[PDB]
Each structure stands twice: as C-alpha cells, then as structure tokens.
Amino acid sequence: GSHPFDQAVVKDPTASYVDVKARRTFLQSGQLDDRLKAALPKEYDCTTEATPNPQQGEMVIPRRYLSGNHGPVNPDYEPVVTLYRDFEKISATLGNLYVATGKPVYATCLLNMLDKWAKADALLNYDPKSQSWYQVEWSAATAAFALSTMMAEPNVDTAQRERVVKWLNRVARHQTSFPGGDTSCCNNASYWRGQEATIIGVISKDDELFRWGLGRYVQAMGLINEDGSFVHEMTRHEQSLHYQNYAMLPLTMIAETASRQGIDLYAYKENGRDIHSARKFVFAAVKNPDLIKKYASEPQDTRAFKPGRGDLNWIEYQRARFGFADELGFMTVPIFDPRTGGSATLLAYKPQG
C-alpha cells in the first residue's frame, strides 16, 4: 500500500503518450488507407491565427445540469464553456499537426497561446465546488497532451516552454488537492483528474503527481462490478451507459501514458476484473440495453455511440494495442477528441492487412 505504483517515477518527460517519432515516420512513409488519409490534419499559418484570450479574474462557470446530475442541460452552460472548447480544440489541433509534420512552427504557435494563459494565471482561481472545477481538468489535460509531444523540440523558446510547464504543474496540483465529494471522489471525474495528473506529472517530472494519477486507475479497477459495469456510472439514470463509456476515456489515456514510462496498467486487476471487463460491458450494452435495466429504468441516451463521436477515441488506442474486433462497426470515420490528445485515428490506428 497505499497503492502498487506509489514508488513509480517519471523516466522520460519527453516520452509523451505516443511514440512521436515512430508515428510521424509511419505517417510519412507508411501504407495509409482512406480513413487514415481522412485523418491528416490540414496545415495552416498558425502564426496569424487569433487565439482565445483567457478569462481575467475568477473562472465562473454555471452548472451543466439544470438540476441534479442528469436530465436537461442548463441553457446558460454552453455559451460560457465555448471559450474553453475553442482553447482545447486549437491546442489539440496544433499538437496533432506537430506530430504529423514535425514543423516547429506548430510548437511555437501552441506555446504562444499557452504562455498567454499562463501569464494570466488561468485555470487557478475558482470555486472548487463549482462547474469550473471540472472545466480545469479537461482544459489542462488537453493542453498538456499537446505540449507533451514537443518537449524534445529544440527550435522553440525554451524559457517559454519551461514557464508553461511550471504553470500546468501548479494548475494540476491545485486542482487535484481537492478530494471531491461522495461521488466525484471516485467516479469518472476522479479518473479525469487522474489523466490530468499523469500527463502533467510526466512533462513536469513531478513524481508525486504521476503517482497520484496512477492511483486513480487503481481506484477505478476496484469499482468494477462483475458484469464489468462501473459502480458510480450506473447511478446516472438515462446517462448511465454514456458515463460508463465516458469513464473509458481517461482510464485509457492514463494507461497509454504510463506505458511510455514502462508501466503496464492494462495488466492491473482487482478481483479478476480489469479495464477489459469494462470494455466488454460497453460493447455488450450498446447491443443490448436490457443489460442496463438492471441498474437504470430510463431509456439510455446513446448520442455518444455514433461514428465520428469524440467519445469513441479510447477505442482507437485500445484496439491498436490489443487488436480486438470493431463489434459495433463504429470505427469508420476518423475520431477527434481534444481531451484525449486529439485524433486517435491519426495517432494510433494501424491499417490491417
């Protein structure tokens, strides 16, 4: 105790969440199929782009849900989070472009945007009890994934990169210093904090942050029912199946990131249950939503289970690694999700001969 990875260290702050050089090499030389071609991001002059300015002062974000933790969405929510969504989108896009092209211009463009946010002490001042707490985990991790691919890049302002790295480290330490509630301590939100702590711990060579991140994956494995369902996600009523899938996203990224540091989280299990059990459940429940009735009576919102949904990004990473079948036939168009490092089609998908 208190968990099996409590002595783990960051070996290589530049290792990112994929083998950057190997993948770029593959993208520039390999035998690409139609879907990988479709995933190639389009080059543009990012030096002339206007990027979102950070909120000055207090980060104030309305609750997502009108009431409780499900049902109709709050009308005031989306107009406010849009700024953050633009920030994430741009960040992930520039990260993906750097991987694909190796052009330092994309790295410099990312750093200038992040420097601007860092200067303003963004993602630091907020009520931990508000929606803002969640927004921080999503945006900070998104920026960190993109930055992680360019930690080895020599043609940038190294002082700027450092300044930006330090900033994200402060963000993550502050954000993860709050235990959360009865649910948020231990549900998908916990796992999102885990991915944030893991990737930021890597790039800032912060072993303590890294370990805390790995710990969240461990916590999750002990919260899987025998059918493979996550305990806390099965209480979300009509969003139950949605949140079961949603949990897969950061858990996968923690695993992928840790694998670059020589740790095999996928192999970790608790009572013979592992992340594979959870995958099987998602696939099985999408086919047969009577599986969910055991937990929730409302018909399930299945908006996430459509080709092209960001929500499926975790499948690209897992399938590349384990070679399982696309049972649902969702892996047709490319997938892009800033919050899990952009396009996992671009970064992980291997055409099968």
Ligand X SMILES: O=C(O)C1=C[C@H](O)[C@H](O)[C@H](O[C@H]2[C@H](O)[C@H](O)[C@H](O[C@H]3[C@H](O)[C@H](O)[C@H](O[C@H]4[C@H](O)[C@H](O)[C@H](O)O[C@@H]4C(=O)O)O[C@@H]3C(=O)O)O[C@H]2C(=O)O)O1
Lookup: tokens for 177 = 């210093």
Contact region for ligand X (CB under 6 A) — 18-26, 148-156, 308-316, 324-332? 308-316
Cβ atoms of residues 4 and 258 within 8 Å: no
Closest CA to 184 of 229, 142, 243, 242: 243
Contact region for ligand X (CB under 6 A) — 2-10, 62-70, 101-109, 160-168? 62-70
Least CB distance to ligand X at residue 35 (A): 16
3 state DSSP class of 10: coil
Lookup: tokens for 163 = 């300044």
What is the pattern of x (binds ligand X, CB under 6 A) and - over residues 97-136? ----------------------------------x--x--
Is 173 among the residues that bind ligand X (CB under 6 A)?
no
Q: What are phi and psi of 270, to 5 degrees?
A: -130, 120
Closest CA to 314 of 258, 250, 241: 250
Least CB distance to ligand X at residue 332 (A): 14
Residues in 136-155 at the binding interface with ligand X, rule: CB under 6 A: none
Is 64 among the residues that bind ligand X (CB under 6 A)?
yes
Q: Which of 17, 243, 246, 317 is catalytic?
A: 243
Nearer to ligand X, 81 or 255 (CB): 81
Distance CA 56, CA 197 (A): 24
Least CB distance to ligand X at residue 167 (A): 22
CA dihedral 222, 224, 227, 232 (to 10 degrees): 150
How many residues lie near ligand X (CB under 6 A)?
12
Nearer to ligand X, 3 or 309 (CB): 309
Least CB distance to ligand X at residue 65 (A): 6
Distance CA 249, CA 282 (A): 12
DSSP state of 270: B
Question: Has 65 been annotated as catalytic?
Answer: no
Tokens 């969504």, residue located? 85
What is the pattern of x (binds ligand X, CB under 6 A) and - over residues 180-219? -------xxx------------------------------
Binding residue for ligand X (CB under 6 A) from 116, 185, 310, 350? 310
Residues linked to residue 270 through DSSP beta bridges, in sequence order: 273
Neighbours of 57 (CB within 10 A): 9
Least CB distance to ligand X at residue 131 (A): 6
Least CB distance to ligand X at residue 338 (A): 8
Number of residue whose CB is nearest ligand X: 310
Closest CA to 117 of 146, 97, 79, 96: 146
Nearer to ligand X, 51 or 245 (CB): 245
Is 230 among the residues that bind ligand X (CB under 6 A)?
no
What is the pattern of x (binds ligand X, CB under 6 A) and - over residues 287-306? ----------------x---
Cβ atoms of residues 81 and 328 within 8 Å: no
CA 59, 71, 191, 181 torsion: positive or negative?
positive
Lookup: tokens for 216 = 């969240």
Catalytic residue positions, numbered: 243
Q: Which residues bind ligand X (CB under 6 A)?
A: 64-65, 69, 131, 134, 187-189, 303, 308-310
